[PDB]
Amino acid sequence: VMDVMNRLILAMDLMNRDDALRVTGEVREYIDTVKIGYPLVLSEGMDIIAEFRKRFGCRIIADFKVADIPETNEKICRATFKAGADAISVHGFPGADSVRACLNVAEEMGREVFLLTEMSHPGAEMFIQGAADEIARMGVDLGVKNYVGPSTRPERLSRLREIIGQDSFLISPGVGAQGGDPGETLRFADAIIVGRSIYLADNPAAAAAGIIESIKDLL
Amino acid sequence: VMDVMNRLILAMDLMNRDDALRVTGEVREYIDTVKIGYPLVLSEGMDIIAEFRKRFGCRIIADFKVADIPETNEKICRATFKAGADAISVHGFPGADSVRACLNVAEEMGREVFLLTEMSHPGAEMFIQGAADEIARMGVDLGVKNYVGPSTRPERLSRLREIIGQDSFLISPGVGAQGGDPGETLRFADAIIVGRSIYLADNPAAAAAGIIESIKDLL
Numbered sequence: 001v002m003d004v005m006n007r008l009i010l011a012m013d014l015m016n017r018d019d020a021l022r023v024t025g026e027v028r029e030y031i032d033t034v035k036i037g038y039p040l041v042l043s044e045g046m047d048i049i050a051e052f053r054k055r056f057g058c059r060i061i062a063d064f065k066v067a068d069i070p071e072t073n074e075k076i077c078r079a080t081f082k083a084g085a086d087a088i089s090v091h092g093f094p095g096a097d098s099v100r101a102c103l104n105v106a107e108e109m110g111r112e113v114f115l116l117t118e119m120s121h122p123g124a125e126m127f128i129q130g131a132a133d134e135i136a137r138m139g140v141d142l143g144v145k146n147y148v149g150p151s152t153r154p155e156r157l158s159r160l161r162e163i164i165g166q167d168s169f170l171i172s173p174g175v176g177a178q179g180g181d182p183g184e185t186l187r188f189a190d191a192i193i194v195g196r197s198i199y200l201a202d203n204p205a206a207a208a209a210g211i212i213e214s215i216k217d218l219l
Numbered sequence: 220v221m222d223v224m225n226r227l228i229l230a231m232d233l234m235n236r237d238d239a240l241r242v243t244g245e246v247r248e249y250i251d252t253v254k255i256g257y258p259l260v261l262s263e264g265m266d267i268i269a270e271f272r273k274r275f276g277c278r279i280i281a282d283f284k285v286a287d288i289p290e291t292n293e294k295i296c297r298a299t300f301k302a303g304a305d306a307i308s309v310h311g312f313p314g315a316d317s318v319r320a321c322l323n324v325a326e327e328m329g330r331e332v333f334l335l336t337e338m339s340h341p342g343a344e345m346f347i348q349g350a351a352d353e354i355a356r357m358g359v360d361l362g363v364k365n366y367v368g369p370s371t372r373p374e375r376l377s378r379l380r381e382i383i384g385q386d387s388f389l390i391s392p393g394v395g396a397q398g399g400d401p402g403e404t405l406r407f408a409d410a411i412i413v414g415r416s417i418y419l420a421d422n423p424a425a426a427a428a429g430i431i432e433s434i435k436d437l438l
């Protein structure tokens with residue numbers, strides 16, 4: 001499975017190229033995996049992925065939460081992987097055919113799919129939470145190996161780990177800004193995703209170092 | 220509501236700028252409303268919206284199926300409207316806070332949100348279909364005025380029309396390539412979305428004219 005340095009993935013959701021590159025540079029010694037989403041890509045373009053690879057050599061997860069019909073999902077993944085992304089996130093709610101479409105392209109291009117199971121925000125309780133266990137089982141049936149689950153609900157994160165098994169790889173956003181605890185989250189997740197607590201910090205480097213200090217026993 | 224020429228919206232999912240522009244230009248006499256999705260945007264950049272506005276007299280719906288947490292949804296909408304999109308599509312299944320985030324940006328920036336209710340592909344049956352009526356009702360309670368529903372399931376499109384009422388605006392994909400019929404769909408939708416049936420045709424203009432001829436009594 002993916003080996004994430006310090007079990008810490010930077011969510012780089014700044015929307016200015018100079019700021020994104022500066023801040024990522026400031027925390028580069030602590031990470032080797034950056035999650036890039038639509039806030040940055042739609043503001044600066046898909047070439048920003050190649051630029052991160054050129055500058056940092058970091059692994060890039062494109063957090064695009066692909067959620068279309070199969071035919072369109074295929075096109076989105078192709079474009080995304082052409083841009084240099086190592087992995088892409090995919091919603092499970094739209095069903096198995098939509099997920100399989102992404103799995104196909106990933107296999108073809110030597111990339112990874114991360115299946116989003118339950119989201120960490122309050123609205124996730126309305127529809128997603130009630131489908132989340134079934135979505136995880138669907139992932140298992142499909143041979144999905146990488147999953148995303150909620151730091152803000154450690155009991156749900158734990159259940160999701162139970163479903164997918166210890167061999168699957170699980171990452172978790174919602175740490176810090178949204179209320180999730182780094183150490184508690186790493187009881188169940190392989191790696192935590194952290195955005196604002198780092199990139200909005202007066203001193204991002206000290207922010208990252210602080211978080212890592214707090215989980216040092218968990219490596 | 221937006222005044223969609225010939226009740227027909229082109230889904231421009233070609234991924235090459237030259238082809239996308241050629242084909243759109245060829246059908247411009249029949250349409251004035253173009254849906255641009257991630258296949259084209261991730262391939263050619265957000266400036267493709269600007270290029271389409273410069274070249275054609277078309278409104279642009281950015282079919283981004285926004286499906287993140289509220290804070291990220293806000294950023295995606297801001298970047299998308301900054302680029303000149305008239306409207307953006309938004310998934311309802313991540314819950315009310317996620318939708319409201321998009322509505323708030325849309326209200327602030329004087330643009331529109333289309334709420335996706337049930338999707339037209341087979342996988343939609345697994346999870347979305349069971350939530351779709353409640354997602355539509357949620358949209359009504361939030362004040363959403365624009366909706367997307369499936370051509371491929373007339374009975375579901377009819378029900379979704381009932382929920383949102385006759386005053387709401389409803390557009391429907393799944394016509395042609397996915398099996399939906401233009402005429403039957405327009406019994407309930409204000410406009411049909413058509414992609415491959417047009418953009419893959421040897422003569423896209425003849426394809427569009429042919430669809431229009433078949434629904435002329437509904438125009």
Ligand SMILES: O=c1cnn([C@@H]2O[C@H](COP(=O)(O)O)[C@@H](O)[C@H]2O)c(=O)[nH]1
Pocket residue numbers: 011013037063118119120121150173174175176177178193194195196197287288291
């Ligand atoms: O369920 C969730 C919640 N958040 N995120 C993403 O993870 C990051 C969390 O950032 P934050 O640490 O600033 O809250 C953001 O990019 C957000 O879109 C998810 O992918 N899934």
Ligand SMILES: O=c1cnn([C@@H]2O[C@H](COP(=O)(O)O)[C@@H](O)[C@H]2O)c(=O)[nH]1
Pocket residue numbers: 068069072230232256282337338339340367369392393394395396397412413414415416
């Ligand atoms: O439920 C659906 C089904 N399709 N689409 C989108 O509408 C277009 C359908 O194109 P087609 O006519 O080539 O099938 C594509 O852009 C597809 O992503 C949706 O937004 N929702």
